[PDB]
Scaffold this active site. Structure first.
Site: not given
Ligand SMILES: O=C(NO)c1c(F)c(F)cc(F)c1F
Ligand SMILES: [K+]
Ligand SMILES: [Zn+2]
Ligand SMILES: [K+]
Length: 354
Positions: A133, A171, A173, A264, A304
């Protein structure tokens, strides 16, 4: 035929002083490392040492302003730390955060160097804080510097400037920072799979949709695979790899593969809401080792559930070591078929394999 492993307990020192139960826990990395010892995978790997990234290395992807601000947090008192962290989207900072971010990046540089010099075939990097990020000019989403993006540029700096690096980001996200850093670049192919939910899932930007295909020279070299309205797991991820990730990757012919390997999306994760299994991650890993003459570096991002990430990463290392794939346990969710079709339409102009 050697697999490298990098892990350093110093990266546990980054911590949340207001909320000691924040999910991006120090013990994320010690738990993964412990599971490697438990399964007797560690003795089968060559240990690669961590090191600190240099400021000049950070400048491969980040602005001098951003580097200077995070660097200065090393000596701030809590009120400055809390105040500075609260200025970013979803960041906590302690006095050890900068050093830990430097160690995560330098660990991956050493691993990429070991791969590219033929000392190891492939490698796994058990590092935190995460990276994907982080943007050129700012921290975001638990990330200070973009470890995977930095490693791609570092690899180019010790080989040739146009070395073809594939980054597969699984990931759950979107890696907004990685996409933006390389959005105008045809030498680094970014492929992300991520929970999207029409933009409602973190990091909450339509930048993650399938129609963002790259800009300028980079047109065609950004591949977003976004999931909507479904608890995705092994069937959907296997299908995305079969139809999209591997055909595009084979055509790109990468010379190095980096995995932004967040866990995650795993079954049991408290944040992702998905159900990819450890066997699923093993199969994704095994497919990627057919690329780049096997030169694969697996970099921890998010994830996590301590048990889930430990089992899932370890299974990936088992595949890198040459163990054979375990056996998977279903018709694709309707929306997953739609997602894959949307990406196929958006990238068929650029990839004749589609
Ligand atoms: O895992 C994450 N990013 O890869 C992530 C994150 F960056 C956040 F800001 C909040 C959150 F709940 C997350 F699970
Ligand atoms: K991703
Ligand atoms: Zn993530
Ligand atoms: K790109």
């Amino acid at each position: 035929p050697i697999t490298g492993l990098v892990y350093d307990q110093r990266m546990m020192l980054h911590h949340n002083m207001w909320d000691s139960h924040h999910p991006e826990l120090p013990q994320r990395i010690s738990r993964i490392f412990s599971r490697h010892e438990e399964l007797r995978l560690l003795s089968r790997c060559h240990r690669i040492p961590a090191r600190l990234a240099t400021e000049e290395e950070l400048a491969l992807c980040h602005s001098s302003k951003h580097i200077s601000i995070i660097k200065s947090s090393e000596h701030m008192k809590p009120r400055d730390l809390n105040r500075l962290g609260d200025e970013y989207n979803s960041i906590f900072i302690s006095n050890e955060s900068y050093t830990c971010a430097l160690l995560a990046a330098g660990s991956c540089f050493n691993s990429a160097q070991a791969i590219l010099t033929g000392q190891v075939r492939n490698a796994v990097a058990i590092v935190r804080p995460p990276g994907h990020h982080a943007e050129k000019d700012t921290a975001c989403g638990f990330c200070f510097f973009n470890t995977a993006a930095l490693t791609a540029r570092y690899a180019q700096s010790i080989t040739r400037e146009s070395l073809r690096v594939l980054i597969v980001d699984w990931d759950v996200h979107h890696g907004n920072g990685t996409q933006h850093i390389f959005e105008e670049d045809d030498s680094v192919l970014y492929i992300s799979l991520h929970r999207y939910e029409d933009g409602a899932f973190f990091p909450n930007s339509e930048d993650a949709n399938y129609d963002k295909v790259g800009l300028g020279k980079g047109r065609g070299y950004n591949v977003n695979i976004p999931w909507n309205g479904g608890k995705m797991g092994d069937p959907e991820y296997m299908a995305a790899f079969h139809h999209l990730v591997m055909p595009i990757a084979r055509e790109f012919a990468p010379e190095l593969v980096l995995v932004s390997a967040g866990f995650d999306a795993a079954r049991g994760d408290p944040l992702g809401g998905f159900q990819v299994t450890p066997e699923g991650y093993a199969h994704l890993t095994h497919q990627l080792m057919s690329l780049a003459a096997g030169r694969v570096l697996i970099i921890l991002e998010g994830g996590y559930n301590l048990t889930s990430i430990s089992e899932s990463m370890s299974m990936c290392t088992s595949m890198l070591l040459g163990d054979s794939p375990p056996s998977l346990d279903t018709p694709l969710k309707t929306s997953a078929t739609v997602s894959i079709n949307n990406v196929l339409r958006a990238h068929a102009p650029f990839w004749s394999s589609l």
